From a paper:
For marine invertebrates with no adaptive immune system, [name] is a major intracellular iron‐storage protein with a critical role in innate immunity. Here, we present the crystal structures of two novel ferritins [Fer147 and Phascolosoma esculenta [name] (PeFer)] from the marine invertebrate P. esculenta, which resides in muddy‐bottom coastal regions. Fer147 and PeFer exhibit the 4‐3‐2 symmetry of cage‐like hollow shells containing 24 subunits, similar to other known ferritins. Fer147 and PeFer contain both the conserved ferroxidase center and threefold channels.
Subtle structural differences in the putative nucleation sites suggest possible routes of metal ion movement in the protein shells. However, the marked variation in the electrostatic potential of the threefold channels in Fer147 and the fourfold channels in PeFer suggests significant diversity between Fer147 and PeFer in terms of metal ion aggregation and cation exclusion.
Numbering used by the authors:
A (entry chain B), B (entry chain E), C (entry chain F), D (entry chain C), E (entry chain D), F (entry chain A): 2 to 171
The structure:
């Protein structure tokens, strides 16, 4: 028996949503780790700390939006282990911004694949859901982090990193 | 000669819009009937009365939005009889929620087919109009009614129906 | 056996109430059709659009008042198909006001026959219900539409129609 | 050697965005010219002046939205000459509204071709961006101008044109 | 060499803080799973949904306070995989409250062991941190959950569960 | 036959006003290009972006002031192609400020020549119009840009540029 709300919602879409939930939880964990590292006494960049805290929270919210969507469509949420980040440490502000862009792009390609899944299965509603709730945000973020990387190179290490961080804080 | 505004609007889309206008007006009528049945002295469930009143109003508003859209694109509205509902009476609260779910699913499949019409004819604007104004709402409604059916089964007949109805009223 | 509330409510009155419900819903549909027609790109009279929208809504409200009354008295609402209007278009502002007057008079005569049903069966409460909630409004409406027809004749086609329509909008 | 933000953004799309930019800047210039013309001492229709001023501004805003989008995706803005309009004058209010409708339709077809480009390259983000920022507005404009042309024909020359112009002014 | 802030902070304390961070993240994930389960269409208990949402947020907050504390003392945060919960599905309200109590007791025993660690290494500040920020909250939660279980047993299944859930929603 | 308002308005002045309209439009387009260049991901100087956006808008406004003036005097606006800027990309902040100064001085010379036209033809009203609405502003912009170039040299590349851009933003 299909679940009562189930209508035009393929099993491959359902599976793919579960995968995407894990990815976003993972991304939130990476950002968490990045955030806490910048508040170490021997790193001490509170603007990077704050920027990656926000990132972490946003990723977790996106995972939760996917959880809700799964149940709304009549799919069943299947959770997996949230793997630990690749690194304990994250280097300079610039390095960590480069790390963040790579993660964002990874998550973006996963979202575009999830969109392609929905399209294949003629799931118009799921297409819209993804476009509105995920895709726009992702291209804004990629643009912003890329701007930050240009500026971190432009200011250089030492005082430059310190002044960039202050302006991240605001 | 086409109408002045007409641009990228197929006759099949135009026709399908008129069929959907009828469908939504029909659905409004069915909810009208349900609504008033629940205010009978020998039924007397004001929460269900209110819930199906709102449903009826919302289905008329969607028919009207489709009427407006037809003329905006340069289509011509063609109206047909609004058929009377299948029943005069609607049973218990649970029965009526099951009837509601079937109607919402039927309306949703028609919307999905209207979207496929728009897509076949490469009517991007129409696909967007349908996704934003119809498809989102329909999946919310399907989920809500499914929740209600679970809770009506969980409370049982009698006092349980009465208490659920109070909660619908708020 | 009779319904629990029922007292001094004849079967003929109950039947006639059902017929009146259909009539008013039909009237609402005619005014819906008129209203939309006036927002076509090749008609484009927003004052007439608004006027007939209001009319449509009012008719539906009166149908709904009769639905409620039927159940208040212990009668049973019996719905029928809502027939499609006799036309798809509606001509000039003047033509459509003439159409409206004929519809209002037809609905008035039905109301008056419904009152006579109530009087025949010595249903004083029904008579009072009909006078207060329907008859007064109908005389006012018939007068107003008559006034509009004199003015539409007085202004003439073209600019005059346009300026009448602006005043309808207000 | 792709730009840092670049992800799922075809060169075809990039170049089509540049062409659209030019087209909207052109359209803004046509509307500028029209707007000015209607404030000539020998034309003197301030409501048409204002209507085409607004249109000019909106077209420029949409060119600028496309400029911002190009850079957001990692594309590079390439500007071309903004060609001067086909005419120095613009005739009557009615003639100018006919001109405006032809311009809007032509901009709309370009937008629809831009959407087809995006679709062909499986650019889901781009599809959405065009739907929500461009396509909706364009169908509304086309309908409005079409309504204005009906009314300008209804009112006729002379006093009729003067009264329509007032109403445009508000 | 030790980190700059390091003073009176044992490696065993540092290690045990990392273990506790993992445990609280794990507990937050179990509560996440429970919370979403309760909003399934075929479960539909919004009060349990909300209760476990709040539980999940609080657990995450307590993990984050441990992260901050690790870095404040000069320790180094070490993250591990956050294991998926034991179940995908969580039964009745009553079953899930029993599950929650067993989780809270396990988290409390770990906190008490963490306090023993701090005491063995004569870390007065740590003891005070644990008492104030963790231990009080835990005994309250354990009391509250225990009260809920008594009440869930007292109301029984069906309507009783529904009414308890309303009261949780408040 | 002259236009009705025409008085003391030489054809050479009318011509020269059309040329100045084009110049200002061209200057607005140059600044628009400069503006959008500084928001590229690989340039990322939002203060410079803002500064040249304002410049672009101001130039447009001054073109439109000339447009209005032409029609006020009874002249006839004649539009020409707005040529595309000399460059696609505009170098560092300092380079672009040097570009801006040269543009400003070119536009100021044009204004001075337009004043000389008006003076030759004993057009006292025009001389004033130019002095008040154009000449004052242009010596302000020339002085401010000159100050900015001194400070861009003072601060140097890298962090200095970054900090000057922040101050531009404010
Ligand atoms: Fe995300
Ligand atoms: Fe993100
Ligand atoms: Fe609907
Ligand atoms: Fe609905
Ligand atoms: Fe009526
Ligand atoms: Fe009426
Ligand atoms: Fe446009
Ligand atoms: Fe969309
Ligand atoms: Fe437009
Ligand atoms: Fe905890
Ligand atoms: Fe807790
Ligand atoms: Fe200027
Ligand atoms: Fe200037
Ligand atoms: Fe009376």
């Amino acid at each position: 028996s299909l679940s009562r709300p189930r209508q035009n919602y393929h099993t491959e879409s359902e599976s793919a949503v579960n995968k995407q939930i894990n990815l976003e939880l993972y991304a939130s964990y990476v950002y968490q780790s990045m955030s806490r590292y910048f508040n170490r006494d021997d790193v001490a960049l509170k603007g990077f700390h704050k920027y990656f805290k926000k990132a972490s929270e946003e990723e977790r919210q996106h995972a939760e939006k996917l959880m809700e969507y799964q149940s709304t469509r009549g799919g069943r949420i299947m959770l997996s282990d949230i793997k630990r980040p690749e690194n304990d440490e994250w280097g300079t502000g610039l390095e960590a911004m480069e790390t963040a862009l790579n993660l964002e792009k990874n998550v973006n390609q996963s979202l575009l694949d999830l969109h392609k899944t929905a399209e294949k299965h003629v799931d118009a509603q799921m297409q819209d859901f993804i476009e509105e709730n995920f895709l726009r945000e992702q291209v804004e973020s990629i643009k912003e982090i890329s701007d930050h990387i240009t500026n971190l190179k432009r200011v250089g290490p030492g005082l430059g990193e310190y002044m960039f961080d202050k302006n991240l804080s605001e």
